[PDB]
Amino acid sequence: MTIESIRVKNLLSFDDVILRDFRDINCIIGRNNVGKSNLLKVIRYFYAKLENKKVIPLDFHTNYNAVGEITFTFDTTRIKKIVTSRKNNGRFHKHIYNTLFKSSSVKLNFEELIARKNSTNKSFFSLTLTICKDDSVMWSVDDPKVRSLLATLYPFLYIETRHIDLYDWNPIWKLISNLNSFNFDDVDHDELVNFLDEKISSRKGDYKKYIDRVVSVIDTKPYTYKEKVINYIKVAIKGDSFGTNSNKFLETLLHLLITLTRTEFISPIVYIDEPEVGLHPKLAESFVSNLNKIYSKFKKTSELSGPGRYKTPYPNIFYSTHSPSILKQTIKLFGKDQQVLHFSKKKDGSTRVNKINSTYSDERFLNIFSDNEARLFFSEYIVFVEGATELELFRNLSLLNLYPAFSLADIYDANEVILANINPGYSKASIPFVIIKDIDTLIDYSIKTEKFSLRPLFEKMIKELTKEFDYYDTGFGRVRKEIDLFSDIQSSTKKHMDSGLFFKRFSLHNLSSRINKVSRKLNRYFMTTTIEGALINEQSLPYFFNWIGDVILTQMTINNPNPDKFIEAMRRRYNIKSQVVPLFKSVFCIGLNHPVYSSAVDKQALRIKLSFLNYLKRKVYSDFNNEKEIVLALRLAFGGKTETQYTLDKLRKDGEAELFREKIKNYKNNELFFLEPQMTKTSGWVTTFLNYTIEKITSEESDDDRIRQKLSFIFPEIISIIEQASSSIEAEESSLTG
C-alpha cells in the first residue's frame, strides 16, 4: 500500500474521522460537499504544509477545543525492503535510510532487529500536524528532511475536471519529469549544450553562432533541472501538442502514471474531482474500462508473467463521482480492488464517513450488475421488495403525489441471494432501508394436517435474534418470551372452516404484529397480506366495483365495423334478459380505440351496459354468502392467497376448495371474461386501480389532508407502510440534514 490511514480531529466539518483500508480504486459518493470538499481541503492543506508552503490554517469544527490534528500514516514497508538490502549502496537509498528508518532502528537490540527482519513485518511512519488556537502549527517530527522526503516518496496529484485546462498541459510535464528517475545532473548542462550544438548544427558552430547571438540578446535565468528534463522529454517525443478532450486529458494522465510508476519506488496518490463531468455515459464507462485495461495489462500475478509485467504497487486513486455509470463500471471491472466511501452528516452536523460493501462473491451478480443496481448507492432510503406488483404500487405517480415524503425512497426488487449480497446491514452502511416481505416466508400452513410448519428463514431469524444465549442478563427478557412463543407456534394446531379458507378463532394480524415488533430491529417489515391482498380489502370493495363499472362503461367498445346493423342483429337474436351474458360477449369487447357510434347504437349499448351491471351486482351478492367470500374470491382470481395463505394453483394441485374454485372458474368464463386478461399479476391492473381510485376520491373531496385520510381509510395497510417509511425518512433526514 501507500497510505495506511488519515485521521482528522476537530477541523472544518470533521469531529473525529479516520479513513483506512485504502484500496487501489477509491470511489467517493454521497450528498454534495457534506465533507467531500472538506476532505479534499484537509489533504491539500496537509500536503501544502508538508512542503513548507505558507497556506492559511483551517478552521475549527468547534471552538471548545484548543487544537485540530491531521495524522497521516505512511506505509514504508517496501521502501525499507528497498534500502535495507546490501546491493543498493546508492546515495539516495543511503539518505532514505539515514532519514526515515534511522532513530527507530538504533534503539532496537539485536534480537528485535532480527525478529523484525525475518518476520513478514509491515512498517509504518506516522506524522501528525497540529493546529493550535493561535494559528501555530506543530509537527510530531521536527526534522524538515523527513517531511520533504515523505513528500517526495508519496506525491499527491489533484486533477479537477470542471476547471481542467485543455491547452495547459504543464502538470503532465511536471509529473513525467519527476516520476521516472533519470539523473541528468551528472550530464553537465555545459557539456550538454556543447554536445547538442555540436550535433544539431548544420555547420558546426552555425547553429551555435545563432544561439550565441540570441543569448547575448536575451537575458535568461539559469535553467532549472525540471525545465531541463521537460525540454529533454518533449523534444525527444514526436509531439508536444495533443467533453471528450477532458476525457482524453484524464485518460492520458492515468496511463502515464500507471505506466511510469512500474520502475520506480515512488507511489503517488491521485485525487480526481468529478471525472464524469461533461461526459456521455458511454464515455465515462469507456474511461473506466480504459483505466482498468491499463491497470491489468501491467499486472503480474502467479499466472501472468513475462517481460512487461511488474509487481510494483500501483498508485492509490481516489475520485469523487455523482454518476451511477462510473460507479457501476468500477465495481464491475475492479472486483475486490476498489472501495466505496459514503459521506453523510451526523446529529451535530459533523461529517460521517462509511465504507459500503461493493465486493460480491457471486460472479453472476457482478455480471448482471447494471445501472439500476448501481443507482441504489446514491439512495437516501431503500424499500426492498419481492415482486413486480410492489414496484407497481409504491411507484404510482398519483399515490406519491399525495405523500411527498415517500418520494425520496427508492423501491427495488431484491431476490434472496441479491438481498444477501447487497443489503446495507451486511455492508454496515448508513443508508437506511426496510425489507418488505410477506408473512408466508416464515410459516406455511397445511390444511390436511391443520398444522403450521416453520420455514428455514424463520429459523435463521431466530438464530440471529438469540444472541442472548451467550451473554448476561438485562432488560431483554420480553424478547426471549416472544421467541419462546415463536417456538410454540410450531407445536400448535389450528382448525379451519369452509374446507380451509378461513380461521375459526385465530387472527394472523396479531401474529404479524408480534413478528413486526420483534423484527423491526433487524429492519424487516412483514406485511400481513400480499400487495394484491392489501388492495382488495373489504373497505375498498365499492371503489373496486366502481372500477369494474368504468372498465365496462368507458374502456369497452363494439366489435363490428357497422355498429347499427350489428347491434340490431344481436338485439334480435339474443334476449336482453335471459341471454345477457352471450349478448354482452358478442357485442362488447375491451379495446384501446373507441370508434364513434350512432346515437341509437350508443343508447342501446348504454342500456345493455346498465342491465349487465345490475345483473352482475345481483349475482355477486347472491352467489357469495358474505363480503369476506367476495374479497377472498377476488384476491384469488388475481393470484392472491387466502387467510390460510393458499394460491389458486396451490389449491388446484392439492385439491381443496373445489366448490370455490369452480365458482371462480364459472365467473371468469361467463361474467368476467372481459377482465380475464387483467387477472394476471403482470397485467398492470394495480396501476389502473390506483389511478381510478385516487382520481375518484379527489373528485369526492377537495382537501389534501382529508384526501390522505380517505386513502388511509381505504388502504389501511399500504398507507400504514408508506406512513411508517415516511416517518423513518423524516427521522433520518433530520439525522442527516437536521
Binding site: 480531529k9 527507530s104 534503539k107 510530531s140 451467550d470 442478563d473
Partner: protein, 370 residues
C-alpha cells in the same frame, strides 16, 4: 443553537409532576434535606445516595437526560461523555515515547459551587421562577446541590453518587480542560483526561515530562479554580507505562506507533476463574474465593426453596461474570479492529482466552439442563 432553559421549560419538561405543588402554590423549592440522603462509607471515601421516592431524584434524572447532555464539552474529557471510554482515553498516547500520569486530589469534593453557578449561568435564563423570592437558576442548583452534614463548613457541595455529579464536574472542569490542552499542545504533548486522571505523552525525544517544571506548570494551571495534584499518584516513565493494568509501549523514535495491551495482573483473575472452572471446584467456592460475590442469608427473597435458590443464584452470578469479562475483552478487540493499536501476540492470547470462556460458558449452560 445553544440550549436555554427558561421558566416554561422548567415547568413543562423538567418539573412535570415532581414539583407541581411547589410551582402552583408559589412556595420556594427547598434544599435536599438530610432525610433524603443516606451516607455510605467505602474505605476512606463517603458516598451520598438520594432516595428514589423523593422528587429531587426525578428532577435530577430528567436534568441529566434533557439539559446537562446538551451543553458542549472539551474533547480531552473522555469520561462520563457520550461515546467516551477508557480505551479512548489511552488511545491518543500510542504515538508518544515518554509518558506522565497525574491525579487530582478529591476532584468532586473540591468543586466549588460558585464555579458551578458561574458555569451553568449562561445556559439558564436569568428569570425569577417563583415571584421575586427564588430564581430559576437557584432552583436548579437546589436540585443539583447538597450540604454535607459531616462538613457544614463548605456549605454547598457536589457529592459523589448523585444523578448529576459527573456531568456537572465535566462542565465545570471544561475551563481547565481547555487551558491544559492549550498548554500541552503548545508544548507538543498529547493530553487526555478521564475524570480526575490526566495522561500526557511526549512523542518527541525529550525529558519534558520527567522534569519538575511540567508538574509545577500543571499545578499552577489547576490552582486557578482551587484544585491540587495528588503527589502519591504521580508517575513518569519512558518507552512504556503500566497504567492501572493497561500497558502502553513505544520503543521507537521518529514516527513510531505504540501498542496497548493488558498486563498479567488484569488477566490474573479471569485466568484463575477459567482454571477453577476447568478444575470442577463448585460454583459457590468460585464465586466466594475469586469474585467476592455471595448470597447473604438476609437477602433470601422467599422461604419456599433455599438450596435450589442458592444454586440458581450462584449459576446466575457465574454466567453474568463470564458474560461481563467476555464483553470487556470484545470491547478491547473492537477497539483494536477500529484503531489498530493493540499488540498482535496479545490479540492472539485474547482470542484463545475468549474461546476458552465461550467453551466454559457452553459447558455451564449445558450442565444447567442436567
Amino acid at each position: 443553537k445553544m440550549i436555554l432553559v427558561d421558566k416554561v421549560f422548567y415547568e413543562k419538561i423538567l418539573s412535570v409532576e415532581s414539583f407541581k405543588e411547589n410551582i402552583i402554590t408559589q412556595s420556594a423549592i427547598p434544599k435536599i434535606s438530610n432525610k433524603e440522603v443516606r451516607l455510605i462509607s467505602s474505605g476512606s471515601k463517603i458516598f451520598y445516595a438520594i432516595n428514589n421516592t423523593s422528587p429531587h431524584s426525578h428532577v435530577q434524572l430528567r436534568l441529566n437526560r434533557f439539559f446537562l447532555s446538551h451543553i458542549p464539552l472539551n474533547s480531552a474529557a473522555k469520561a462520563f461523555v457520550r461515546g467516551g471510554s477508557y480505551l479512548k482515553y489511552l488511545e491518543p498516547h500510542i504515538y508518544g515515547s515518554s509518558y506522565c500520569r497525574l491525579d487530582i486530589s478529591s476532584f468532586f469534593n473540591n468543586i466549588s459551587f460558585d464555579d458551578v453557578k458561574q458555569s451553568l449561568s449562561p445556559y439558564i435564563k436569568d428569570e425569577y421562577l417563583i415571584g421575586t423570592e427564588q430564581k430559576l437558576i437557584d432552583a436548579i442548583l437546589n436540585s443539583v446541590g447538597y450540604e454535607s452534614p459531616i462538613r457544614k463548613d463548605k456549605g454547598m457541595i457536589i457529592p459523589m453518587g448523585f444523578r448529576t455529579s459527573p456531568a456537572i464536574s465535566n462542565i465545570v472542569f471544561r475551563k481547565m480542560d481547555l487551558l491544559i490542552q492549550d498548554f500541552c499542545a503548545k508544548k507538543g504533548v498529547i493530553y487526555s483526561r478521564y475524570a480526575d486522571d490526566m495522561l500526557f505523552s511526549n512523542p518527541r525525544e525529550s525529558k519534558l515530562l520527567m522534569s519538575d517544571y511540567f508538574i509545577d506548570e500543571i499545578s499552577s494551571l489547576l490552582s486557578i479554580m482551587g484544585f491540587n495534584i495528588n503527589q502519591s499518584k504521580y508517575i513518569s516513565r519512558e518507552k512504556e507505562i503500566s497504567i492501572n493494568g493497561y500497558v502502553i509501549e513505544n520503543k521507537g523514535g521518529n514516527g513510531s506507533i505504540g501498542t496497548i495491551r493488558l498486563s498479567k495482573s488484569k488477566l490474573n483473575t479471569v485466568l484463575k476463574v477459567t482454571h477453577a472452572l476447568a478444575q470442577n471446584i463448585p460454583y459457590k467456592n468460585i464465586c466466594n474465593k475469586y469474585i467476592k460475590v455471595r448470597l447473604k442469608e438476609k437477602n433470601i427473597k422467599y422461604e419456599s426453596k433455599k438450596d435450589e435458590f442458592e444454586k440458581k443464584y450462584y449459576r446466575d452470578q457465574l454466567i453474568n461474570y463470564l458474560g461481563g469479562y467476555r464483553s470487556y475483552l470484545i470491547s478491547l478487540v473492537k477497539f483494536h479492529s477500529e484503531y489498530k493499536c493493540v499488540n498482535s501476540d496479545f490479540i492472539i492470547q485474547i482470542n484463545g482466552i475468549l474461546n476458552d470462556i465461550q467453551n466454559h460458558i457452553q459447558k455451564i449452560k449445558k450442565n444447567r439442563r442436567l
